[PDB]
Coordinates of C-alpha atoms in Angstrom, one line a residue:
Chain N
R3 CA -13.4 -29.7 11.8
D4 CA -14.3 -26.6 13.7
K5 CA -14.7 -23.3 11.7
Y6 CA -13.3 -20.0 12.8
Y7 CA -13.5 -16.5 11.5
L8 CA -11.1 -13.4 11.7
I9 CA -12.8 -10.2 10.4
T10 CA -11.2 -6.9 10.0
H11 CA -11.9 -3.4 8.6
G12 CA -8.7 -3.2 6.4
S13 CA -6.2 -5.7 4.7
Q14 CA -3.9 -3.8 2.5
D15 CA -1.5 -2.6 5.2
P16 CA 1.5 -4.9 6.0
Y17 CA 0.0 -4.7 9.6
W18 CA -2.8 -6.7 8.5
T19 CA -0.8 -9.3 6.7
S20 CA 1.2 -10.0 9.9
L21 CA -1.8 -10.1 11.9
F22 CA -3.5 -12.6 9.3
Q23 CA -0.4 -14.7 9.3
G24 CA -0.4 -15.1 13.2
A25 CA -3.9 -16.3 12.9
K26 CA -3.4 -18.7 9.9
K27 CA -0.1 -20.0 11.8
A28 CA -2.4 -20.8 15.1
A29 CA -5.2 -22.3 13.0
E30 CA -2.7 -24.7 11.3
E31 CA -1.0 -25.9 14.5
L32 CA -4.3 -26.4 16.3
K33 CA -5.7 -27.9 13.1
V34 CA -8.9 -26.0 12.7
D35 CA -10.4 -24.1 9.8
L36 CA -9.8 -20.4 9.4
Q37 CA -11.5 -18.0 7.2
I38 CA -10.4 -14.3 7.0
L39 CA -12.8 -11.6 6.1
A40 CA -11.7 -8.0 5.3
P41 CA -12.9 -5.3 2.9
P42 CA -10.6 -4.4 0.0
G43 CA -9.6 -1.3 1.3
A44 CA -8.3 0.3 4.4
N45 CA -11.9 0.9 5.9
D46 CA -15.2 0.2 5.0
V47 CA -17.2 -0.5 8.2
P48 CA -20.5 -1.1 6.5
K49 CA -19.0 -3.9 4.6
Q50 CA -17.4 -5.4 7.7
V51 CA -20.9 -5.4 9.5
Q52 CA -21.8 -7.5 6.4
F53 CA -19.0 -9.9 6.9
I54 CA -19.9 -10.5 10.6
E55 CA -23.6 -11.0 9.9
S56 CA -22.8 -13.5 7.1
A57 CA -20.4 -15.3 9.5
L58 CA -22.7 -15.5 12.3
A59 CA -25.4 -17.4 10.0
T60 CA -23.0 -20.3 9.7
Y61 CA -22.8 -20.8 13.5
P62 CA -19.1 -20.7 13.8
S63 CA -17.1 -22.0 16.6
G64 CA -15.7 -18.5 17.3
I65 CA -15.0 -15.1 15.6
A66 CA -12.2 -12.8 16.1
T67 CA -13.3 -9.2 14.9
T68 CA -12.0 -5.5 15.1
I69 CA -14.6 -3.1 16.4
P70 CA -13.3 0.3 15.2
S71 CA -16.8 1.7 15.8
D72 CA -18.9 2.4 19.2
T73 CA -22.2 2.0 17.3
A74 CA -21.9 0.4 13.8
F75 CA -21.5 -3.2 15.4
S76 CA -24.0 -3.0 18.3
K77 CA -26.6 -4.9 16.6
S78 CA -24.4 -7.6 15.2
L79 CA -22.5 -8.1 18.4
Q80 CA -25.8 -8.4 20.5
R81 CA -26.9 -10.9 17.9
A82 CA -23.9 -12.9 18.3
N83 CA -24.1 -12.7 22.1
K84 CA -27.6 -14.2 22.0
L85 CA -26.8 -16.9 19.7
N86 CA -23.9 -17.9 22.1
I87 CA -21.2 -17.6 19.4
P88 CA -18.1 -16.4 21.2
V89 CA -16.6 -13.2 20.0
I90 CA -13.0 -12.0 20.8
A91 CA -12.1 -8.3 19.9
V92 CA -8.7 -7.8 18.3
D93 CA -6.9 -4.5 17.4
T94 CA -9.7 -2.2 18.2
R95 CA -12.5 -2.3 21.0
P96 CA -15.7 -0.4 21.9
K97 CA -15.9 1.4 25.1
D98 CA -19.3 0.0 26.1
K99 CA -19.5 -3.8 26.3
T100 CA -23.2 -3.9 27.3
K101 CA -23.8 -2.1 23.9
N102 CA -21.1 -3.9 22.1
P103 CA -20.6 -7.4 23.7
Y104 CA -17.5 -9.4 23.2
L105 CA -15.6 -11.9 25.5
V106 CA -12.2 -10.6 25.7
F107 CA -9.8 -8.1 23.8
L108 CA -6.3 -8.7 22.5
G109 CA -4.5 -5.7 21.4
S110 CA -2.9 -2.6 22.6
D111 CA -4.1 0.0 25.2
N112 CA -4.4 2.6 22.5
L113 CA -4.9 5.5 25.1
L114 CA -1.7 4.7 26.9
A115 CA 0.3 3.7 23.8
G116 CA -0.2 7.3 22.7
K117 CA 0.8 8.7 26.0
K118 CA 4.0 6.6 25.8
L119 CA 4.8 7.8 22.3
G120 CA 4.2 11.5 23.4
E121 CA 6.5 11.0 26.4
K122 CA 9.0 9.4 24.1
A123 CA 9.0 12.1 21.6
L124 CA 9.4 14.8 24.2
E125 CA 12.1 12.7 25.7
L126 CA 14.2 12.3 22.5
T127 CA 13.6 15.8 21.2
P128 CA 13.0 18.0 24.4
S129 CA 13.6 21.2 22.1
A130 CA 10.3 20.5 20.4
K131 CA 7.8 23.4 20.6
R132 CA 5.5 22.4 17.7
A133 CA 4.2 19.1 16.8
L134 CA 1.8 17.7 14.1
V135 CA -0.3 14.5 14.5
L136 CA -1.4 12.6 11.3
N137 CA -4.6 10.9 11.2
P138 CA -5.4 8.7 8.2
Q139 CA -8.8 7.9 9.5
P140 CA -10.5 10.3 11.6
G141 CA -13.4 8.5 13.5
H142 CA -11.4 5.2 14.1
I143 CA -12.1 5.0 17.8
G144 CA -8.8 3.3 18.1
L145 CA -6.7 5.9 16.4
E146 CA -8.8 8.7 18.4
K147 CA -7.5 7.3 21.7
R148 CA -4.1 7.2 20.4
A149 CA -4.2 10.8 19.3
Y150 CA -5.9 11.7 22.6
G151 CA -3.1 10.2 24.6
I152 CA -0.2 12.0 22.7
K153 CA -2.1 15.3 23.1
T154 CA -2.4 15.2 26.8
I155 CA 1.3 14.8 26.9
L156 CA 1.9 17.6 24.7
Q157 CA -0.4 19.9 26.3
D158 CA 0.7 19.1 29.9
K159 CA 4.2 20.0 28.6
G160 CA 3.2 23.2 26.8
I161 CA 3.9 21.9 23.3
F162 CA 1.8 23.5 20.5
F163 CA 0.2 20.9 18.3
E164 CA -2.7 20.3 15.8
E165 CA -3.9 17.0 14.4
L166 CA -4.6 16.7 10.6
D167 CA -6.8 14.3 8.6
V168 CA -4.6 13.1 5.7
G169 CA -6.6 10.2 4.4
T170 CA -5.0 7.2 3.0
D171 CA -4.1 8.3 -0.6
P172 CA -0.3 8.7 -0.5
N173 CA -0.4 12.0 -2.9
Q174 CA -2.9 13.6 -0.5
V175 CA -1.0 12.8 2.7
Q176 CA 2.2 14.4 1.1
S177 CA 0.3 17.4 -0.1
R178 CA -1.7 18.0 3.2
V179 CA 1.9 17.8 5.1
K180 CA 3.6 20.0 2.7
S181 CA 0.9 22.6 3.1
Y182 CA 1.1 22.4 6.7
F183 CA 4.9 22.9 6.8
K184 CA 4.9 25.8 4.4
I185 CA 2.6 27.8 7.0
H186 CA 4.4 26.2 10.0
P187 CA 7.9 25.7 8.9
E188 CA 9.0 25.5 12.4
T189 CA 7.0 22.2 13.2
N190 CA 9.8 20.1 14.9
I191 CA 7.7 16.8 15.6
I192 CA 5.4 14.6 13.4
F193 CA 3.1 11.9 14.9
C194 CA 1.8 9.2 12.5
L195 CA -1.3 7.3 13.8
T196 CA -0.6 4.3 11.3
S197 CA 2.0 3.3 8.9
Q198 CA -0.5 4.5 6.3
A199 CA 0.2 8.0 7.1
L200 CA 4.1 7.2 7.6
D201 CA 4.9 5.6 4.3
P202 CA 4.0 8.6 2.1
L203 CA 5.9 10.9 4.6
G204 CA 8.8 8.4 4.4
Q205 CA 9.2 8.9 0.9
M206 CA 9.6 12.8 1.0
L207 CA 12.1 12.1 4.0
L208 CA 14.2 9.7 1.7
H209 CA 14.2 12.3 -1.2
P210 CA 13.9 15.7 0.5
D211 CA 14.8 17.7 -2.7
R212 CA 12.6 15.9 -5.0
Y213 CA 9.7 16.7 -2.7
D214 CA 10.7 19.9 -1.5
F215 CA 10.4 18.8 2.0
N216 CA 13.9 19.6 3.5
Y217 CA 12.6 20.3 7.0
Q218 CA 13.9 17.0 8.7
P219 CA 11.2 16.7 11.4
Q220 CA 11.6 14.2 14.3
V221 CA 9.0 11.5 13.4
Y222 CA 7.1 9.0 15.5
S223 CA 4.6 6.2 14.4
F224 CA 2.7 3.2 15.2
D225 CA 3.6 -0.2 13.8
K226 CA 7.0 -1.6 12.7
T227 CA 6.2 -2.4 9.2
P228 CA 9.0 -3.3 6.6
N229 CA 9.5 0.2 5.4
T230 CA 9.0 1.7 8.8
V231 CA 11.8 -0.4 10.0
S232 CA 13.9 0.7 7.2
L233 CA 13.3 4.5 8.2
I234 CA 14.4 3.8 11.8
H235 CA 17.5 2.0 10.7
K236 CA 18.2 5.2 8.5
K237 CA 17.6 7.3 11.5
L238 CA 14.7 9.2 9.7
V239 CA 12.2 8.1 12.4
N240 CA 12.9 8.0 16.1
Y241 CA 10.6 5.6 17.5
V242 CA 7.6 3.3 16.8
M243 CA 5.2 1.7 19.0
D244 CA 4.9 -2.0 18.3
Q245 CA 1.4 -3.7 18.8
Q246 CA 2.8 -7.2 17.6
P247 CA 0.0 -8.0 15.3
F248 CA 1.3 -11.4 14.6
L249 CA 1.1 -12.4 18.2
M250 CA -2.3 -10.9 18.3
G251 CA -3.5 -13.0 15.7
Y252 CA -2.0 -16.2 16.9
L253 CA -3.2 -15.8 20.5
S254 CA -6.8 -14.8 19.4
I255 CA -7.2 -18.1 17.4
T256 CA -5.7 -19.9 20.2
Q257 CA -7.9 -18.6 22.8
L258 CA -11.0 -19.5 20.7
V259 CA -9.7 -22.9 20.4
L260 CA -9.0 -23.7 23.9
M261 CA -12.4 -22.3 24.8
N262 CA -14.2 -24.5 22.5
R263 CA -12.0 -27.8 23.2
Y264 CA -11.4 -27.4 27.0
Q265 CA -14.3 -25.0 28.3
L266 CA -11.6 -22.5 29.3
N267 CA -12.5 -18.8 29.8
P268 CA -10.5 -16.6 27.4
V269 CA -8.7 -13.4 29.1
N270 CA -8.0 -10.0 27.8
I271 CA -4.3 -9.6 26.8
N272 CA -2.3 -6.4 26.2
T273 CA -0.2 -7.5 23.1
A274 CA 2.2 -4.2 23.0
Chain H
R3 CA -3.0 29.7 -15.5
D4 CA -3.4 27.0 -18.1
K5 CA -5.0 23.8 -16.7
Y6 CA -3.5 20.3 -17.1
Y7 CA -4.6 16.9 -16.2
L8 CA -2.5 13.7 -15.2
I9 CA -4.5 10.9 -15.4
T10 CA -3.7 7.1 -14.3
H11 CA -5.2 3.8 -13.5
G12 CA -3.7 3.5 -10.1
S13 CA -2.6 5.7 -7.0
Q14 CA -1.4 3.3 -4.2
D15 CA 1.8 2.0 -5.7
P16 CA 4.7 4.4 -4.3
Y17 CA 5.7 4.5 -7.9
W18 CA 2.8 6.6 -8.6
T19 CA 3.6 9.3 -5.9
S20 CA 6.9 9.5 -7.7
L21 CA 5.4 10.2 -11.0
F22 CA 3.0 12.5 -9.4
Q23 CA 5.7 14.6 -7.6
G24 CA 7.6 15.0 -10.9
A25 CA 4.6 16.3 -12.7
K26 CA 3.7 18.6 -9.8
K27 CA 7.3 19.9 -9.6
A28 CA 7.2 20.6 -13.4
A29 CA 3.7 22.3 -12.9
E30 CA 5.1 24.6 -10.0
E31 CA 8.3 25.6 -12.1
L32 CA 6.2 26.3 -15.1
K33 CA 3.5 28.0 -13.2
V34 CA 0.6 26.1 -14.7
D35 CA -2.2 24.4 -12.6
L36 CA -2.4 20.5 -12.6
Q37 CA -4.9 18.2 -11.4
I38 CA -4.4 14.6 -10.9
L39 CA -7.2 12.0 -11.4
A40 CA -6.6 8.3 -10.2
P41 CA -8.9 5.5 -8.8
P42 CA -8.6 5.1 -5.1
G43 CA -7.7 1.4 -5.6
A44 CA -4.7 0.1 -7.6
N45 CA -6.8 -0.5 -10.9
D46 CA -10.0 0.5 -12.2
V47 CA -10.4 1.3 -15.8
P48 CA -13.9 2.3 -16.3
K49 CA -13.4 4.9 -13.5
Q50 CA -10.3 6.2 -15.3
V51 CA -12.4 6.6 -18.6
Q52 CA -14.9 8.6 -16.8
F53 CA -12.0 10.7 -15.4
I54 CA -10.7 11.2 -18.9
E55 CA -14.3 12.0 -20.0
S56 CA -15.1 14.6 -17.4
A57 CA -11.6 16.1 -17.9
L58 CA -12.4 16.8 -21.6
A59 CA -15.6 18.6 -20.7
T60 CA -13.5 21.2 -19.0
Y61 CA -11.4 22.0 -22.4
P62 CA -7.9 21.8 -20.5
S63 CA -4.7 22.9 -22.2
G64 CA -3.5 19.2 -22.1
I65 CA -3.8 15.8 -20.5
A66 CA -1.1 13.2 -19.7
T67 CA -2.7 9.6 -19.3
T68 CA -1.7 6.1 -19.0
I69 CA -3.5 3.8 -21.5
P70 CA -3.5 0.2 -20.0
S71 CA -6.1 -1.1 -22.7
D72 CA -6.3 -1.5 -26.2
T73 CA -10.0 -1.0 -26.2
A74 CA -11.4 0.8 -23.0
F75 CA -10.0 4.2 -24.0
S76 CA -10.5 4.4 -27.8
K77 CA -13.5 6.5 -27.8
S78 CA -12.2 9.0 -25.3
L79 CA -9.0 9.2 -27.0
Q80 CA -10.7 10.0 -30.3
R81 CA -13.2 12.4 -28.7
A82 CA -10.2 14.4 -27.3
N83 CA -8.5 14.1 -30.8
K84 CA -11.6 15.9 -32.1
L85 CA -11.8 18.5 -29.5
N86 CA -8.1 19.4 -30.4
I87 CA -7.0 18.9 -26.7
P88 CA -3.5 17.4 -26.7
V89 CA -3.1 14.1 -25.2
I90 CA 0.4 12.5 -24.1
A91 CA 0.7 8.8 -23.3
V92 CA 2.7 8.1 -20.0
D93 CA 3.8 4.7 -18.5
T94 CA 1.7 2.6 -20.7
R95 CA 0.6 2.9 -24.3
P96 CA -1.8 1.1 -26.7
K97 CA -0.6 -1.1 -29.5
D98 CA -2.5 1.0 -32.3
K99 CA -2.6 4.7 -32.1
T100 CA -4.8 4.9 -35.1
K101 CA -7.7 3.6 -32.8
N102 CA -6.1 5.1 -29.8
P103 CA -4.9 8.5 -30.8
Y104 CA -2.4 10.2 -28.6
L105 CA 0.5 12.6 -29.7
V106 CA 3.6 10.9 -28.0
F107 CA 4.6 8.4 -25.2
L108 CA 6.9 8.9 -22.3
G109 CA 7.8 5.9 -20.5
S110 CA 9.9 2.6 -21.0
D111 CA 9.7 0.1 -23.7
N112 CA 8.0 -2.6 -21.6
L113 CA 8.8 -5.6 -23.9
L114 CA 12.5 -4.5 -24.1
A115 CA 12.4 -3.9 -20.3
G116 CA 11.5 -7.4 -19.8
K117 CA 13.9 -9.0 -21.9
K118 CA 16.5 -6.9 -20.2
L119 CA 15.5 -8.1 -16.7
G120 CA 15.4 -11.7 -18.0
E121 CA 19.0 -11.3 -19.1
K122 CA 20.2 -9.8 -16.0
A123 CA 18.4 -12.5 -13.9
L124 CA 20.3 -15.2 -15.8
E125 CA 23.6 -13.4 -15.5
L126 CA 23.1 -13.1 -11.6
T127 CA 21.5 -16.3 -11.0
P128 CA 23.6 -18.9 -13.1
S129 CA 22.2 -21.6 -11.0
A130 CA 18.5 -20.7 -12.6
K131 CA 16.4 -23.8 -12.6
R132 CA 12.7 -22.7 -12.6
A133 CA 11.3 -19.1 -12.5
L134 CA 8.1 -17.7 -11.3
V135 CA 6.5 -14.5 -12.9
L136 CA 4.0 -12.8 -10.7
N137 CA 1.5 -10.7 -12.4
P138 CA -0.7 -8.4 -10.2
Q139 CA -2.8 -7.2 -13.0
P140 CA -3.9 -9.3 -15.7
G141 CA -5.4 -7.1 -18.3
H142 CA -2.6 -4.4 -18.1
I143 CA -1.3 -4.5 -21.4
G144 CA 2.0 -2.9 -20.3
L145 CA 2.6 -5.8 -17.8
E146 CA 1.7 -8.3 -20.6
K147 CA 4.9 -6.8 -22.5
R148 CA 7.2 -7.2 -19.5
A149 CA 5.9 -10.9 -19.0
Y150 CA 6.5 -11.6 -22.6
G151 CA 9.9 -10.0 -22.6
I152 CA 10.9 -12.2 -19.6
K153 CA 9.6 -15.4 -20.9
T154 CA 11.5 -15.1 -24.3
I155 CA 14.9 -14.9 -22.4
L156 CA 13.7 -17.8 -20.3
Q157 CA 12.6 -19.8 -23.3
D158 CA 15.9 -19.3 -25.1
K159 CA 17.8 -20.7 -22.1
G160 CA 15.6 -23.6 -21.6
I161 CA 14.5 -22.5 -18.0
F162 CA 11.3 -23.7 -17.0
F163 CA 8.8 -21.0 -16.1
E164 CA 5.2 -20.1 -15.2
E165 CA 3.2 -16.7 -15.0
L166 CA 0.9 -16.5 -11.8
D167 CA -2.0 -14.2 -11.7
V168 CA -1.5 -12.9 -7.8
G169 CA -3.7 -9.9 -8.0
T170 CA -2.9 -7.0 -5.6
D171 CA -4.4 -8.2 -2.2
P172 CA -1.3 -8.9 0.1
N173 CA -2.9 -11.9 1.7
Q174 CA -3.7 -13.6 -1.7
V175 CA -0.3 -12.9 -3.4
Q176 CA 1.4 -14.5 -0.5
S177 CA -1.2 -17.4 -0.4
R178 CA -0.8 -18.1 -4.1
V179 CA 3.0 -17.8 -4.0
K180 CA 3.3 -20.2 -1.2
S181 CA 1.1 -22.9 -2.9
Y182 CA 3.3 -22.6 -5.8
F183 CA 6.4 -23.4 -3.9
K184 CA 4.8 -26.2 -2.2
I185 CA 4.3 -27.7 -5.6
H186 CA 7.5 -26.7 -7.1
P187 CA 10.1 -26.3 -4.3
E188 CA 13.0 -26.0 -6.9
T189 CA 11.5 -22.6 -8.1
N190 CA 14.7 -20.5 -7.3
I191 CA 14.0 -17.3 -9.4
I192 CA 11.0 -14.9 -8.8
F193 CA 10.1 -12.0 -11.2
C194 CA 7.7 -9.3 -9.8
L195 CA 6.1 -7.3 -12.6
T196 CA 5.5 -4.3 -10.2
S197 CA 6.1 -3.5 -6.7
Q198 CA 2.5 -4.6 -5.8
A199 CA 3.7 -8.1 -6.1
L200 CA 6.9 -7.5 -4.4
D201 CA 5.8 -6.0 -1.2
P202 CA 3.8 -8.8 0.2
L203 CA 6.5 -11.2 -1.0
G204 CA 9.1 -9.1 0.7
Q205 CA 7.3 -9.5 4.1
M206 CA 8.0 -13.3 3.9
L207 CA 11.4 -12.9 2.7
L208 CA 12.0 -10.8 5.8
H209 CA 10.4 -13.2 8.1
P210 CA 10.8 -16.7 6.4
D211 CA 9.9 -18.6 9.6
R212 CA 6.5 -16.6 10.4
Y213 CA 5.5 -17.3 6.8
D214 CA 6.9 -20.7 6.4
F215 CA 8.8 -19.5 3.3
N216 CA 12.5 -20.5 3.7
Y217 CA 13.0 -21.1 0.1
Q218 CA 15.1 -18.0 -0.2
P219 CA 14.5 -17.7 -4.0
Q220 CA 16.4 -14.9 -6.2
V221 CA 14.1 -12.1 -6.8
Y222 CA 13.8 -9.5 -9.8
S223 CA 11.3 -6.7 -10.0
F224 CA 10.4 -3.4 -11.4
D225 CA 10.6 0.1 -9.9
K226 CA 12.8 1.1 -7.1
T227 CA 10.2 2.0 -4.5
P228 CA 11.4 2.8 -0.8
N229 CA 10.6 -0.9 0.4
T230 CA 12.3 -2.4 -2.8
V231 CA 15.4 -0.2 -2.3
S232 CA 15.5 -1.7 1.3
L233 CA 15.2 -5.3 0.0
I234 CA 17.8 -4.6 -2.4
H235 CA 20.3 -3.3 0.4
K236 CA 19.4 -6.5 2.5
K237 CA 20.2 -8.9 -0.6
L238 CA 16.7 -10.2 -0.7
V239 CA 16.1 -8.8 -4.0
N240 CA 19.0 -9.0 -6.9
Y241 CA 18.1 -6.5 -9.5
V242 CA 15.4 -4.0 -10.2
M243 CA 14.3 -2.2 -13.4
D244 CA 14.1 1.5 -13.1
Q245 CA 11.8 3.4 -15.3
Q246 CA 12.5 6.8 -13.6
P247 CA 8.9 7.9 -12.8
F248 CA 9.9 11.4 -11.6
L249 CA 11.5 12.2 -14.9
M250 CA 8.5 10.7 -16.7
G251 CA 6.2 13.1 -14.8
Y252 CA 8.2 16.1 -14.9
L253 CA 8.9 15.7 -18.7
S254 CA 5.3 14.9 -19.7
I255 CA 3.8 18.2 -18.2
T256 CA 6.9 20.1 -19.4
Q257 CA 6.1 18.9 -23.0
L258 CA 2.6 19.7 -22.9
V259 CA 3.3 23.2 -21.8
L260 CA 6.0 24.0 -24.2
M261 CA 3.5 22.7 -26.8
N262 CA 0.9 25.2 -25.8
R263 CA 3.5 28.3 -25.1
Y264 CA 5.7 27.8 -28.0
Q265 CA 3.9 25.9 -30.7
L266 CA 6.3 23.0 -30.5
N267 CA 5.8 19.3 -31.3
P268 CA 6.1 17.2 -28.2
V269 CA 8.3 14.0 -29.0
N270 CA 8.3 10.4 -27.8
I271 CA 10.8 9.9 -24.9
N272 CA 12.0 6.4 -23.6
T273 CA 12.5 7.3 -19.8
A274 CA 14.7 4.1 -19.1
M275 CA 18.3 4.2 -17.8

């Protein structure tokens, strides 16, 4: 019974559970064992590196892991490459494969997704002159590419903008945003790099009087989580890039299995 | 301005942000300062105890805090009592205030709320065969009262039931729930003690094929969070108890202030509908 691992840097978001279920679904249909390793929070890279090192020591048939840092995983990844343990990157990938080796990547092209969302925003709300980008985890190389994409679209079109570190604590996200709007009450658009930033904002959009947030800005986000879908339906959110985490999880375990059982070579896949 | 503290044992549940906003809004209108202290997770008692302890050192005008344990907070509460710092209990309260002193309690009567949820589920779900109670926080004395209240109603009607400790990790809640249904497929009623149990469950109710969860049970819960409200509109959840956290927040800070500015005695307030 071949053993496989799916290791990530977070697990509380609805995004993670979709991805986890896709992988579990593939594991079940292909009849292989899957162990999921993820820190108790939204981000804890040193703990993730720990999981990867522990998994490697069990000589698994394959590992699918997120790689949200350009340096924190280098040693672990290099080790895995030397021991010939196939590693597939999912969700987030490093910019240098020689320093951070892995076989292929399954996920979105974060830089492009951002550009696509910025373009969509200016297309659905051309009258925009001021935008706000909410980053729940500055440093996350994947989110950094998204923000960069959006920003290149905004600047090229002359739109003013600023990126804000909101963290993941709901109360802090809401107050950082309310603080920004009091100083710039003209902000017309808000970009949420993940649903972690959207959820706290959505609550204020749903109860504008209770939160003293009647601005009614145009909002764009990433990931179609249950609450995100509800806000779209309510027309409080204009557009959301979907990375299809379930497809991502399912296909990653599938390629690892096909490689082991048939000596096939996995390939990169843009799951957007 | 006078300094006030709102201390809780959690901060991720959308329920808290609603409580926090009510407290902040009251602070704003009354022109007092308010600091909110809550562990980064969804439950951390020792951390909360330290928060209360460090708050006391600053000799604040008042403190509002949850008390989810009959033992963990005793010393801190007694200390606060000796320093003459007013303490109001919100959301959850201890069974014995002689050992755990606090002035008044603003929140709902957990036991009664549980009984009420149980009675409503039996009304709306006449076909009731077997119920499952999902506890995301064993140890939380408020949730124990809820579960107990629900079980008394279920026992009275001869409905089979079981309480399951699902924790708060979304993946684990789903896993443990699916395992139970594989063993008891006839289970047709689910009671979620908080939205922390409901969210991961709601994801499966929205994509039953993806999660291999086509049972379609009747669901009951506590706290009308955004996702909970959405699930209600989609008829995936039948009835949800509302404790009105915003009101709880607003009124608790308001009483602490009226107490300091006007020499009034605060009173207990059941915030339920």
